[PDB]
Design a protein around this ligand. Structure first.
Ligand SMILES: Nc1ncnc2c1ncn2[C@@H]1O[C@H](COP(=O)(O)OP(=O)(O)O)[C@@H](O)[C@H]1O
Ligand SMILES: Nc1ncnc2c1ncn2[C@@H]1O[C@H](COP(=O)(O)OP(=O)(O)O)[C@@H](O)[C@H]1O
Ligand SMILES: [Mg+2]
Ligand SMILES: [Mg+2]
Lengths: 371, 468, 371
């Protein structure tokens, strides 16, 4: 029945049919509106640009993210995003395609209830389902145990799984993510003479972060090296010229994931939250969790993050146990691959929330035996 | 592998030892009662004087030599990483030279496949098992495509430009083959023959219903398709054996024991056809049993998962499309994902295509059996013939025919011949048959053909001879 | 035909065929249920793990012993254990194989009756028999007189036998056994700061008890030595590193057998109960009983238990009397060897409880002359 798979995520919307190993449509989750008056008569601009077109018109619009950290904060933008994804990108009729939606752990139940209400009453999908990001990521990695770290653009969480049995009491959620890294990158680039304030320059700073940032294995030694030598400086091409040279700010920005005190946060780094989450589990499964540390999410794609995290965990873990971190090249699209794999399974066909069952059980059907 | 054609061995870089190739050595190296040299001479003589030339024959020999060569790379896993890297960069060079490809490019494509996400491209990590499955799938796919291309070339040579109308089809497919070590291939053959038997039963029911409508009276108007659809549903329908195997192929950590456990959890006791294996005559081992149309058949589970996975690499296919050889013709065209490809799915779709092709033609069934296991016509083994007759369903077919009223005779001929049963047009025939002390429930009156139960005509005619 | 010799015991089920030299299948008698929920769909975990399989999944299962002190409390778990033993560990169909069961002395008649009923109905064995765990242990030692002490994991009984004639009035049963020692080790390990509370950690504490614990010849002298010296401290490696060192708690755990007041018990020690049972018998058979003290069971495997027991009983016994304690290397499996020897006897073939006899005489036939 070629069921549909979607991944709202945060900052990027990726969707496609089940049974594939790659999303067919990937575009930012951005809705923008014009802020100037417009003098040309007859062209008839539309009142809202959604998706990839807002990036093309980035210099005349005001970009807004409908989701802050996983939770939707502007719903009308979410119906607009879903309509765009279903019609302009995939060109499909959602009246005969079951839709699988991926949602983060530890979120308000009203969020899932409203997602199901929108799917059933606005688009009239025959069936739907809501799943956890980490479980799908572990599907895509071809594993059955191991703590998985999923750091995207909205929220970073660790979910430990052993033999297909979750450990909910050890699930930890941290709101530090890529958006905070971009904000800190602006706050640390403002000291060189480069000021990025508008929402359009958000995208430029994000591109600089994606292209020129890396995680250093050591911090103090790297700072000493950069403070004397000029081998760490690189130049970037702004969309109009005036090349900018970034020095130690390229590895100082991702250090927030390991030193969250940079942005005033109270919590500890991911290298410590993962160790704590492992230690909250039982003593008989800590070996497999130590030896099957799985990474996913776009934020975990910094060159050198895996080595630094492995070094930190080995410093924390007992010296008599091996530490292995799995970082496949396709971390960013792992969740969608896992979702497609799950939707392609035939034993999953009886776990859909049907239209009749939803009508019988109301919006509270999500938290019942059907998940 | 025969040494009487040194040119092929020289250009194919073959050591003439079948044990040096894992694709061939794992089976039986050689057998008696055959001389493959004469068969090679016949085949290459047919290839030479035919529609096509010999350069493409040399290309096909090169392709089959490369297929033999794929069973040699090692693909050692890298240290402290799950990625796989090659070790024996010698047979890879030979294969690249045979296909005209770049050895480095082929190795990079095998180790690091590239997939298009959104509008960009990303690489995928693959360990030794994934690349082994990919190269096996590539080998089997290229072999099948080469065979299909050869068949198409022979066909294109064969035809002539006379107008064609309402062709006549001839088909030959092996029957219900049953051994003591039934496996996945035997299951596929049994499923194909099961579908063929279903088609035959449906055709027989259609003919019987046509006769009933001709005579205006329907006797036991129940379709025989449902009498046989149980096994097809157990095999083809979702939650069946094939679907469970397909979904187990994609599960992260799936083994054969898990496959058997899921089969038992899903079908043991739910369906009448599925049942526990039996231990008779000291057979090696069995895992599950089905009550097929020919009887109880027990299969084996080990090896199904490895031989069902068909992960077709795409970057290697793109490399194939850029070769200086016949690979462009073979791979001219190449939507379900590449990884989500299985032998069972392709077999099912091919069987469906064959069935939908055969449905449009009026069938004619011919059954062929071997009387003796040896070549001596004098002696014929009774158990073998019994098993083959049970598999072919000739007894089943005749019982289906005799279940209704197969005895039909013409009224006037009956009146003018069988009156001698008790010696001394519709109404006269009815009076004659009712005056011979015949129960009214046994016969059925019509207009042209009279329906008689099996045995009534035999008893009527055997007593008629006595009264002569 | 062949007969099966089983030994349910308490915490270790060992079984095999009659005539063999050693048991073919030995595995713990535990049943485990998944206490979590399970997020991965399609795997289809079984709802009950039985035998040594439950030991591999100690981190996602809760372990329950169907036998607490000799007697069976949960009967469905025991039926599952028996089915597993007959169909997986041995892979033999029991419809044509007589079975020889064992049980401890001084048990409720309901336990034996229900055991016989289950064996005759659920598995439909052609014949069955129940034997005392002490007579078999005496058989395996090649003796015909002398007391035997079968200190297992659930119960500790001392059965005196002279010239093949048992003395039912001198049988003494004590419930202090290996499980109580493991619980006391749990209690005293908290003294050093190590907390073992979960049922999975029970297996770990049992492992330390088996590996490191030993019986001291003199309790007070060893107390003085351990307090001043440090040569008694040994380290054990937990399944996740963080090695732990146990000192004075090494010989304190098995001292409970000789000092039952440690765990609040009022009864006297093993050495005193043995002497009391010796003097409970006649006066003309005390010499052979003194000279033929036989030890068996898993709990009697502590290094140096025989020497301490001999010293204590010699202190109790008259000075002009000879004392010998028989401690073969295979104390743990002595009962099964004796059972196999008994089932292999030709004269025993007329003592089986036939199915027709059971159907004629009801479940109470076992307490009759057919023991
Ligand atoms: N190559 C890269 N290097 C550094 N950061 C990256 C890279 N690619 C993506 N990111 C960061 O990851 C974020 C995208 O996260 P994403 O995987 O889309 O989360 P979700 O899938 O939950 O929406 C972007 O905001 C970007 O800052
Ligand atoms: N070497 C050893 N040292 C101390 N205790 C042991 C040793 N070996 C086994 N045990 C204890 O003995 C118990 C096994 O007793 P067992 O003979 O199986 O009893 P039963 O015959 O009732 O099943 C285990 O619980 C274990 O704690
Ligand atoms: Mg994400
Ligand atoms: Mg015992």
């Amino acid at each position: 029945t070629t069921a549909l798979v979607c991944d709202n995520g945060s900052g990027l919307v990726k969707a496609g049919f089940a049974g594939d190993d790659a999303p067919r449509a990937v575009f930012p989750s951005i809705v923008g509106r014009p802020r100037h008056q417009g003098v040309m008569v007859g062209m008839g601009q539309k009142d809202s640009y959604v998706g990839d077109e807002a990036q093309s018109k980035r210099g005349i619009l005001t970009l807004k993210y409908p989701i802050e950290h996983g939770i939707i904060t502007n719903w009308d933008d979410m119906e607009k995003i879903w309509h765009h994804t279903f019609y302009n990108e995939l060109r499909v009729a959602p009246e005969e395609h079951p839709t699988l939606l991926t949602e983060a752990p530890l979120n308000p139940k009203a969020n899932r209830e409203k997602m199901t209400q929108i799917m059933f009453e606005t688009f009239n999908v025959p069936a739907m389902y809501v799943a956890i990001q980490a479980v799908l990521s572990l599907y895509a990695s071809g594993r059955t145990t191991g703590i998985v770290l999923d750091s995207g653009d909205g929220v970073t969480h660790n979910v430990p799984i052993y033999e297909g049995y979750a450990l909910p009491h050890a699930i930890m959620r941290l709101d530090l993510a890529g958006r905070d890294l971009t904000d800190y990158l602006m706050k640390i680039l403002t000291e060189r003479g480069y000021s990025f304030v508008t929402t359009a320059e958000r995208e430029i700073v994000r591109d600089i972060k994606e292209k020129l940032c890396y995680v250093a294995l050591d911090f103090e030694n790297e700072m000493a090296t950069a403070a004397s030598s000029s081998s760490l400086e690189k130049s970037y091409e702004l969309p109009d010229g005036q090349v900018i040279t970034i020095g130690n700010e390229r590895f100082r920005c991702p250090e927030t994931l390991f030193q969250p005190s940079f942005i005033g946060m109270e919590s500890a780094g991911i290298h410590e939250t993962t160790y704590n989450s492992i230690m909250k589990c039982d003593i008989d499964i800590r070996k497999d969790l130590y030896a099957n540390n799985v990474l996913s999410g776009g934020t975990t794609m910094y060159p050198g993050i895996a080595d630094r995290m492995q070094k930190e965990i080995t410093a924390l873990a007992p010296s008599t146990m091996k530490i292995k971190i799995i970082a496949p090249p396709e971390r960013k699209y792992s969740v969608w691959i896992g979702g497609s794999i799950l939707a392609s399974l035939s034993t999953f066909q009886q776990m859909w929330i049907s239209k009749q069952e939803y009508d019988e059980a109301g919006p509270s059907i999500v938290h019942r035996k059907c998940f | 592998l025969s040494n009487k054609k040194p040119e092929l061995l020289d250009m194919l870089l073959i050591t003439n030892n079948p044990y040096d190739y894992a694709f061939i050595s794992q089976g039986e190296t050689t057998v008696a009662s055959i001389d493959d040299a004469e068969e090679l001479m016949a085949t290459d003589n047919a290839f030479d004087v035919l529609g096509f030339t010999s350069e493409e024959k040399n290309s096909m020999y090169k392709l089959t030599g490369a297929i033999m060569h794929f069973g040699n790379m090692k693909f050692k896993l890298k240290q402290r990483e799950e990625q796989a890297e090659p070790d024996g960069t010698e047979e890879a060079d030979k294969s690249a030279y045979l296909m005209g490809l770049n050895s480095a490019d082929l190795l990079k494509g095998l180790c690091h496949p590239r997939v298009k996400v959104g509008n960009e491209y990303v690489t995928k990590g693959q360990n030794v098992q994934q690349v082994i499955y990919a190269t096996g799938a590539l080998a089997k796919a290229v072999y099948e495509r080469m065979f299909n291309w050869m068949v198409t070339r022979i066909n294109a040579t064969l035809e002539t430009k006379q107008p064609r109308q309402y062709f006549i089809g001839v088909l030959d497919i092996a029957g219900f083959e049953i051994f003591d070590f039934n496996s996945f291939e035997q299951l596929c053959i049994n499923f194909t023959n099961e579908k063929l038997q279903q088609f035959f039963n449906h055709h027989m029911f259609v003919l019987e219903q046509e006769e009933y409508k001709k005579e205006g009276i329907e006797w036991t108007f129940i379709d025989f398709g449902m009498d046989l659809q149980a096994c097809i549903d157990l095999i083809e329908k979702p939650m069946g054996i094939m679907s469970i195997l397909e979904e187990e192929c994609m599960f992260p950590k799936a083994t054969d024991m898990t496959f058997k456990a899921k089969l038992f959890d899903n079908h043991l006791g739910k369906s009448a056809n599925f049942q526990k294996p039996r231990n008779i005559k000291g057979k090696p081992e069995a895992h599950f049993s089905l009550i097929h149309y020919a009887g109880i058949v027990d299969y084996n589970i080990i090896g199904w998962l490895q031989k069902n996975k068909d992960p077709l690499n795409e970057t290697v296919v793109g490399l194939y499309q850029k070769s200086s050889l016949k690979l462009l013709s073979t791979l001219f065209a190449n939507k379900k994902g590449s990884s989500f490809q299985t032998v069972s799915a392709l077999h099912r779709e091919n069987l469906n295509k064959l069935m939908t092709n055969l449905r449009s033609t009026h069938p004619h069934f011919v059954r062929c059996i071997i009387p003796n296991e040896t070549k001596s016509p004098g002696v014929m083994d009774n158990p073998l013939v019994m098993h083959q007759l049970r598999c072919n369903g000739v007894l089943e077919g005749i019982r289906i025919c005799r279940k209704g009223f197969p005895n039909r005779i013409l009224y006037g001929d009956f009146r003018q011949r069988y009156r001698i049963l008790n010696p001394a047009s519709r109404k006269g025939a009815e009076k004659l048959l009712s005056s011979l002390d015949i129960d009214h429930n046994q016969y059925k009156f019509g207009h042209t053909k009279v329906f008689f139960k099996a045995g009534l005509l035999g008893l009527l005619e055997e007593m008629r001879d006595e009264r002569l």
